[model samples]
Target: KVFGRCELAAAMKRHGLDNYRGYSLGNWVCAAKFESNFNTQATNRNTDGSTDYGILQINSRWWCNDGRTPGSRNLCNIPCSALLSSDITASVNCAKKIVSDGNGMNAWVAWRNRCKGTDVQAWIRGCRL
Candidate 1:
């Protein structure tokens, strides 16, 4: 019944990243796990030099120009780790933009192919993004 968690996962899955790109998926999952343990409500001490906070690990205090707090609903536009906690489409789309909008779909496909029984870091690097 939780909304943000289910929606974020569903959004990631719908992008087909979970099936084809084991590497990116693995890395993304690993990063998330390492960063927040997949807990959307998780928050880190920003002043501790980590410069990060919230599920997507977004440093809202630093990145956002609107003065929005990390994990805030307005993060849907900033497209950071907050995207992971709030909106999947925004998260994936933002990632695509970062990778290269024109090649975003192909990049994701590559992620799927490279992750096959392999390390996610390799797939992430393969994106060259």
Candidate 2:
């Protein structure tokens, strides 16, 4: 499932992503855009052979399992498919764990490359929340 920008923002806010682990809504929104463009079913294959899953692109190497591979730390204790749902609850919860792990948004390269030190307000522009 793919969500519009504002819809994604609202969902993120509803999931407490606006202030999750000290990161702002704009940071989440911008990272999601660069990572998956709000597509719940999104996946990316990394050069290291792991896969990134869902809107936040949580990696299968340490976060979740893609089922075909078996080396994941499973820190989120969820299947990678769980992150690929439109509901987003699992993804949000797992992301909270990632942030709490001390990497913060740096867990996402998109955030570090595009959102860090940048004015991300445009990511939430026109969203009335």
Candidate 3:
């Protein structure tokens, strides 16, 4: 695991992702909590036969290639396994590219369902960031 809530917040801050593309650090933290519980090695199988990978749970449909999932956009140009590492640099960079495509955090269903319109201040409550 790369982070708990506080550590995740600090890492995001260090990555200059606290408010990249108008999304707040709290939104990212809340999404991570719901999506993967801060576990970098997290993976989820979707009903569509594709899978979500990493701390952000990026989809193989458009982000990464799992090799089994054919026709993946592979927009991140990365292997799905890369996102599962404790070093989240690649994952975070890919997430930034995904968010920059204009989806914002809405690309993450967790953020859309949980963090959006919610008071997420507690997600980053005490990291000294």
The predictions' CA RMSDs to the true structure, in order, are 9.4, 1.1, 1.0
Clashing pairs in 3: none
Q: By descending lDDT, how would the candidates be arranged?
A: 2, 3, 1
Model 2 lDDT tens row, 18-56 = 988888899999999999989999998888888999999
TM-score of each: 0.43, 0.95, 0.95
Tens-place lDDT digits, model 3, residues 29-97: 999899899999999999888899988999999999899786668999999999999888878899999
- What is the alpha-carbon lDDT of model 1 when measured against the actual structure? 0.44
The numbered model that scores best in lDDT is 2
**TM-score sort, best first:** 3, 2, 1
Alpha-carbon lDDT, every model:
0.44, 0.91, 0.89
Better of 1 and 2 by lDDT: 2
Against the true structure, candidate 3 reaches a TM-score of: 0.95
> For model 1, how does the per-residue alpha-carbon lDDT over 1-129 read when each residue is reduced to its tens digit?
123333434445577545332224554543444455556555554553433444335444434323445443433366344544544454444444434424432333333454334564432333322
lDDT of 3 at 109: 80
Q: Please give the lDDT score for candidate 3.
A: 0.89
RMSD of 2: 1.1
